Amino acid sequence: MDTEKLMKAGEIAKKVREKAIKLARPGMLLLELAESIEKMIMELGGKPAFPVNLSINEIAAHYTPYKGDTTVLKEGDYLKIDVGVHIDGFIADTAVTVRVGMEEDELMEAAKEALNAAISVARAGVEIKELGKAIENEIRKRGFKPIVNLSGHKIERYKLHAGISIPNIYRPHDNYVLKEGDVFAIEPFATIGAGQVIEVPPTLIYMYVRDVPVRVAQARFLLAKIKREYGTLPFAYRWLQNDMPEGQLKLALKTLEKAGAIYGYPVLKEIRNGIVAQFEHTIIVEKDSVIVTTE
Ligand code: MET
Numbered sequence: 001m002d003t004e005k006l007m008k009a010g011e012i013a014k015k016v017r018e019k020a021i022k023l024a025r026p027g028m029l030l031l032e033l034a035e036s037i038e039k040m041i042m043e044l045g046g047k048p049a050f051p052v053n054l055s056i057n058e059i060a061a062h063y064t065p066y067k068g069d070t071t072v073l074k075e076g077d078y079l080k081i082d083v084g085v086h087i088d089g090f091i092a093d094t095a096v097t098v099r100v101g102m103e104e105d106e107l108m109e110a111a112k113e114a115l116n117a118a119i120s121v122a123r124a125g126v127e128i129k130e131l132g133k134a135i136e137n138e139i140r141k142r143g144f145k146p147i148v149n150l151s152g153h154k155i156e157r158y159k160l161h162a163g164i165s166i167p168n169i170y171r172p173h174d175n176y177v178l179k180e181g182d183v184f185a186i187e188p189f190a191t192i193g194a195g196q197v198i199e200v201p202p203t204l205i206y207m208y209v210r211d212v213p214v215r216v217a218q219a220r221f222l223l224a225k226i227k228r229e230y231g232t233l234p235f236a237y238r239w240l241q242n243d244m245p246e247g248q249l250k251l252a253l254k255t256l257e258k259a260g261a262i263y264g265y266p267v268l269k270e271i272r273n274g275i276v277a278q279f280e281h282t283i284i285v286e287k288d289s290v291i292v293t294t295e
């Protein structure tokens with residue numbers, strides 16, 4: 001339950017994130033970018049907490065390339081790089097928004113500053129809604145809209161989403177009190193849209209949740225793999241594309257999802273297709289202050 005492991009993951013995450021920004025150049029194939037980042041995490045002695053998310057513009061999050069993905073980077077693209085690393089279950093969840101081949105603009109500044117704002121107020125004994133207020137005001141005061149159905153979350157060993165959120169808006173009932181030992185991921189999301197995300201195809205990220213009886217053999221076999229190799233952490237569709245043909249893989253996945261054996265994470269898009277910016281850091285709450293493990 002190490003602060004070292006948490007910190008180690010934190011520094012690793014940072015390293016691969018900063019590099020990801022330099023590679024995020026126009027003409028860069030999303031697929032290549034992804035496998036470079038993930039490859040860099042292991043070379044550093046870490047493990048992906050989840051497949052690196054690469055979301056462009058209106059696409060808010062939960063997008064990761066796949067084998068055969070032709071999606072390529074171009075100048076002006078508001079690319080959100082959400083990197084996740086874990087050391088023996090100790091996670092580090094961070095992200096940045098880079099507008100390919102250009103500089104940071106207002107929208108991006110809103111999300112970033114929102115983050116900085118939230119972090120500066122984060123202290124043991126402080127109610128989560130305080131962070132929310134801080135975040136919302138940094139985004140709105142800049143004329144943008146926070147995304148209401150996407151927020152930070154408490155993080156625990158081998159558990160990305162611990163069950164306590166940090167909304168990007170102020171809510172009178174978010175009265176949970178930050179305490180020493182708590183690990184949270186603060187990820188303010190800002191957009192020029194309505195400020196709400198929706199589910200849309202395809203489904204490129206999944207996660208094991210429950211071991212349930214499965215009739216079909218191939219599906220049953222896959223479930224066992226997912227469980228054994230990906231445990232209780234999200235995995236990418238891409239990571240399994242070398243296991244079996246496309247047709248069979250999709251069916252298997254589809255079945256397991258149906259049986260309620262695994263969770264499917266469809267790509268999230270702004271409800272008005274408004275460009276979306278996101279900045280995220282992981283923090284550890286201590287007695288006198290918080291520690292941003294990923295800055
Ligand atoms: C679906 S994998 C992406 C997880 C995302 N980084 C989050 O903060 O929840």
Ligand SMILES: [Mn+2]
Pocket residue numbers: 082083084093094095187280
């Ligand atoms: Mn993230």
Ligand SMILES: [Mn+2]
Pocket residue numbers: 093152153185187280
């Ligand atoms: Mn997160």
